[PDB]
Design goal:
Blueprint (H helix, E strand, L loop, with lengths): L2 H18 L6 E2 L1 H12 L16 E5 L2 H9 L11 H7 L5 E11 L3 E11 L5 H4 L2
Parallel strand pairs: 1-3
Antiparallel strand pairs: 2-4, 3-4
PDB class: lipid binding protein
Keywords: pathogenesis-related protein 1, Cacao infection, selenourea, lipid binding protein
Assembly: monomeric
């Protein structure tokens, strides 16, 4: 595990997407990244145990960073419906900060797959607030 490159890759993926669209870059926040790992550690994509006011303000996904990120941005198509929220978290105007974390989990007696989680601050709100 190389932390410095880890932060770089995640930030680049996020900031590429927003740079294209004339948006301010996101800054890394360690606290979020920690919380991200707390959630990542559980090996539970469907029913994570969450804590905090911003507990739900996160994306979750399987495999490599690129694959996981793409799967979120792929949801752009149906904006502004609730199916596109993954993508909304990434490109919300209001959003300032991201932190990501990972965990290696195992398909029982088969193979190991990475789990990725990113947290966002401020958390996503209503349609109007998000673009403010």
């Amino acid at each position: 595990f190389d932390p410095d490159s880890f932060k770089n890759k995640w930030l680049e993926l996020h900031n590429n997407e927003r740079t294209t669209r004339q948006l301010d870059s996101l800054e890394w926040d360690g606290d979020l990244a920690w919380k991200a790992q707390q959630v990542a550690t559980q090996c539970n994509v469907d029913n994570p145990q969450l804590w905090g006011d911003n507990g739900a303000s996160f994306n979750i996904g399987r495999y490599t960073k690129e694959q996981a990120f793409a799967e979120w941005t792929a949801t752009s198509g149906s904006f502004p419906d609730d199916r596109s929220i993954p993508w909304q978290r990434i490109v919300a105007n209001s959003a300032q900060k991201v932190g990501c974390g990972e965990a290696t989990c195992v398909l029982e007696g088969d193979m190991a797959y990475t789990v990725n989680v990113c947290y966002y601050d401020p958390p996503l709100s209503d349609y109007y607030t998000n673009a403010g």
